[PDB]
């Protein structure tokens, strides 16, 4: 089964550069073309450039000249994206797509994982884990909302569960946002009101990178 | 460059249904070697894109009969002959006939359901928080549809948007809707200046901004 293996998330402050790694397993990156696509959060698809791995031969998209080096070592069967002097605009996803054949037999087209590059100058940060608990009381036979606030961490990830997983209808987790180098992330539950104070809910935050294991419980105002 | 421009941006879609997404190039993308580039490929969440379609209408190997593609040199249509739920997702077109490659903005295929009201709820700071010297205003805006929504932040009666964070959730897999939270940061010095905090939501659900408010001194 033919793989294409690219490097683990990559963490890099501006002004330096970074070099992501596809590793081909199962074919020869020299019968192929590499493609690399440059996706940002929350945005569409972004063509970087080619490279014939065989010849030496590339192509880059004009934006990438300059930031972009592609390059290829075949006897490790890797082709390797450099990003250079970077900034926050070069927070993204990277993938590699190995492609060819499409005049002279079946078309190949495989892809990458994706590699994630985050552009900050944070050391590794534990979070703070604050307790949302609603600002007044709930009517009869109602639904309550309560929160879970995780800010001032860095890197990615971290996790949260309520009631140690235990709780896991009407619960929603946002997406971390890094804003000033470190990151925000929110989780609500959604619980009937008799069962709220009434019961302990408590939210669960892990964060592997510093250690930290928080559970804070949500008590009334 | 060769710009490729999709429509529509968003398709919301029954199971079942037919589904046509089109794509525009600025220019011919026919090659002088007389091949057509023009691929289409889905992308779903936390995954990279898959090829369909190549050289307009030629279904990749694997690809499900339902997917068919058609075009001249440059109106391009990608059609899905009856929707699944696998299916769901982003789409985008793809020229590779001229350098730079360029992909179209991409085209949300998503399941269409009924309108659902936001619920909207508003936390002020915690007191663990307010020790550590910040204050955060949560306001959580749940299980809402149509996607289309707007969130504001008044401090006594006032925009604010500086230290205003949003984040979001895709459609959920059960019950078709999407979430989103906006927490407004403030410094604890701030926060304790004024006294009314407000965050509102336009959405179809309502001909109103949809509000939630609390008062810092109770
Ligand atoms: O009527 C039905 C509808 O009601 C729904 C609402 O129900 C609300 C009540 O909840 C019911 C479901 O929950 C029942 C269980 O409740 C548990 C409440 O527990 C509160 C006390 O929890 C304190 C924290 O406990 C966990 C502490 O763990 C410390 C060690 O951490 C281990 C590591 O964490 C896991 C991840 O790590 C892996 C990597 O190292
Ligand atoms: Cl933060
Ligand atoms: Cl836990
Ligand atoms: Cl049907
Ligand atoms: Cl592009
Ligand atoms: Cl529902
Ligand atoms: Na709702």
């Known amino acids: 089964e033919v793989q294409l293996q690219q490097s683990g998330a990559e963490i890099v402050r501006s002004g330096a550069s970074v070099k992501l790694s596809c590793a081909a397993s199962g074919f020869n990156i020299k019968d192929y073309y590499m493609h690399w696509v440059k996706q940002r959060p929350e945005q569409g698809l972004e063509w970087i450039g080619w490279i014939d791995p065989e010849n030496g031969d590339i192509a880059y998209a004009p934006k990438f000249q300059g930031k972009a080096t592609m390059t290829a070592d075949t006897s490790s069967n890797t082709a390797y994206l450099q990003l250079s002097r970077l900034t926050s605009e070069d927070t993204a996803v990277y993938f590699c797509?190995?492609?060819?054949?499409?005049?002279?037999?079946?078309?190949?087209?495989?892809w990458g994982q994706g590699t994630t590059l985050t552009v900050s100058s944070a050391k590794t940060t534990p979070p703070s884990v604050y307790p949302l608990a609603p600002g007044s009381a709930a009517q009869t036979n109602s639904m309550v909302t309560l929160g879970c606030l995780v800010k001032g961490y860095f890197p990615e990830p971290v996790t949260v569960t309520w009631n140690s997983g235990s709780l896991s209808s009407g619960v929603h987790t946002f997406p971390a946002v890094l804003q000033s180098d470190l990151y925000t992330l929110s989780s609500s539950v959604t619980v009937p009101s008799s069962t709220w104070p009434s019961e302990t809910v408590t939210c669960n935050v892990a964060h592997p990178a510093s250690s930290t294991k928080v559970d804070k419980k949500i008590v009334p105002r | 460059d060769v710009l490729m421009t999709q429509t529509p941006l968003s398709l919301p879609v029954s199971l079942g249904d037919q589904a046509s997404i089109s794509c525009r190039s600025s220019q011919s993308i026919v090659h002088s070697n007389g091949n057509t580039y023009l691929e289409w490929y889905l992308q779903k969440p936390g995954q990279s894109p898959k090829l369909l379609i190549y050289?307009?209408?030629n279904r990749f190997s694997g690809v499900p009969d339902r997917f068919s593609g058609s075009g001249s040199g440059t109106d391009f249509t990608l059609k899905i002959s009856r929707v699944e739920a696998e299916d769901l997702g982003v789409y985008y077109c793809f020229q590779g006939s001229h350098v730079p490659w360029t992909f179209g903005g991409g085209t949300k295929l998503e399941i269409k359901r009924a309108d659902a009201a936001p619920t909207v709820s508003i936390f002020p700071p915690s007191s663990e928080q307010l020790t550590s010297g910040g204050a955060s205003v949560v306001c959580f805006l749940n299980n809402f549809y149509p996607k289309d929504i707007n969130v504001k932040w008044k401090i006594d009666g006032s925009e604010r948007q500086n230290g205003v964070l949003n984040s979001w959730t895709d459609q959920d897999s059960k019950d078709s809707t999407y979430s989103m939270s906006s927490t407004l940061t403030l410094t604890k010095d701030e926060y304790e200046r004024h006294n009314s905090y407000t965050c509102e939501a336009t959405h179809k659900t309502s001909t109103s901004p949809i509000v939630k408010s609390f008062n810092r001194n109770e």
């Open positions: 797509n190995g492609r060819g054949g499409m005049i002279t037999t079946d078309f190949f087209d495989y």
């Open positions: 050289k307009v209408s």
